[PDB]
Design a protein around this ligand. Sequence first.
Ligand SMILES: Cc1cc2c(cc1C1(c3ccc(C(=O)O)cn3)CC1)C(C)(C)CCC2(C)C
Ligand SMILES: CC1(C)CCC(C)(C)c2cc(C(=O)Nc3ccc(C(=O)O)cc3)ccc21
Lengths: 216, 7, 11, 241
Amino acid sequence: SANEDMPVEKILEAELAVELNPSSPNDPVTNICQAADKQLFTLVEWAKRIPHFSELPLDDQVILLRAGWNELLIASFSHRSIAVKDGILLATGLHVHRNSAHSAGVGAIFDRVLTELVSKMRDMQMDKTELGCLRAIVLFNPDSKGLSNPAEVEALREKVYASLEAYCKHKYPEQPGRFAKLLLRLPALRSIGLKCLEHLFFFKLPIDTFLMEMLE
Amino acid sequence: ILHRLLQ
Amino acid sequence: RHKILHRLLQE
Amino acid sequence: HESYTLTPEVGELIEKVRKAHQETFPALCQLGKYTTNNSSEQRVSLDIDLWDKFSELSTKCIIKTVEFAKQLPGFTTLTIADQITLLKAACLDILILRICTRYTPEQDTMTFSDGLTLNRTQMHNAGFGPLTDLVFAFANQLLPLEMDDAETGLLSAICLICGDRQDLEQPDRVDMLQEPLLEALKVYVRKRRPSRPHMFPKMLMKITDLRSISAKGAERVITLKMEIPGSMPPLIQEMLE
Ligand SMILES: Cc1cc2c(cc1C1(c3ccc(C(=O)O)cn3)CC1)C(C)(C)CCC2(C)C
Ligand SMILES: CC1(C)CCC(C)(C)c2cc(C(=O)Nc3ccc(C(=O)O)cc3)ccc21
């Protein structure tokens, strides 16, 4: 009963529940950071829907979300941009393509998101259940500084392993390395997630409410 | 604030 | 460029 | 239920990779350790004596890594431009993974292929610098995995033959070569440890830590260039360019 301890259906429910004049600027960076701020409000309610997250001590939830929020949002907007051709779809419903990202100076990290994340997710046809599980793996990171009882966090992450793999072997029986290929997207997610944080901090030289506090 | 959105 | 690496891979 | 044996196609891939790793990386089990006394107590910016030896050993193991790479099935059949890109992008990952395998926790030391055993302080002064505690903390995380030669070589092969590398000319072809390595590792880890299946995803996730550590390695060669008396060895320059 690997799905009895970490059900992939409730993880998918956590993902589904999180899905006049033009007063919107056009500088792509401000549009990207604005959408990131209002998705941080979305991610908090997502994490509490992930099984056993709110059962951890309150500060452990604070550290876990403040540790992987960048990876957690990069994951679900790149997976949101599967059908987008050479671009990403922000949570505000606005799109950002390559040239508008190139002229903004972020084309380097943009092309890596496009080729190492969304292109990998699309050509493998990653479904929302697998995306939610990979996010639950990123959330349950025992390496985050200050966690009391990191083994409790490591145990929850390992539970997602067993249930995600059980899901991959059940619904994708002809792809035995499917569970592994899903996990192998996390190296590209961690690296771009930190390269996005250096882009973010180098930009504080427009502001948002929740985003500025997540960068304290 | 992150600490308030959690009840 | 990469003339040491090229020597390794052609062997 | 599961078979105590391996598929003949999988067994000879594992045998091939195990032989490649052992022939290019002797285990700590068969190494006569020898120690030195250069900068054995206090941490300094850079011990030039240790840096020359460490840089020379790193040049030797890069050669061994390339010799390990050419024995992996299909690596020599990809374009040399892709082989150069794959080795360049994974060289620091392999070197760090290899030296972390030779970590003796009782003495807090690590042993190189020639037998040289340096303590944490000497490892720092040889050139590691700010990376020392991260590397030692990674080698510590490697001990409960109990990886043998086949698993260490397979994980090395998986880090090298990776399809999401930049400038790759045939990334899907590289992805196909990685698929049997992932399959070989999964069935090999879980059959040696039938009680704990989580050891396979736990072992793959250290690649994520490995690529995060090697990113800091690329941020150390930029500052090591300003502290060493001459230039980097030519092979190290070609790999980390
Ligand atoms: C703020 C931010 C800035 C940037 C990026 C991503 C984000 C983030 C984000 C973007 C969009 C959404 C969303 O709409 O769901 C959520 N989070 C926080 C990760 C990338 C790396 C794409 C390119 C470079 C810049 C422009 C610096
Ligand atoms: C990034 C940094 C600090 C600067 C550039 C170099 C010097 C290339 C380097 C090399 C290693 C490394 O792991 N070298 C190894 C040398 C010999 C063996 C062996 O004998 O088995 C194993 C590993 C680590 C970090 C760095």
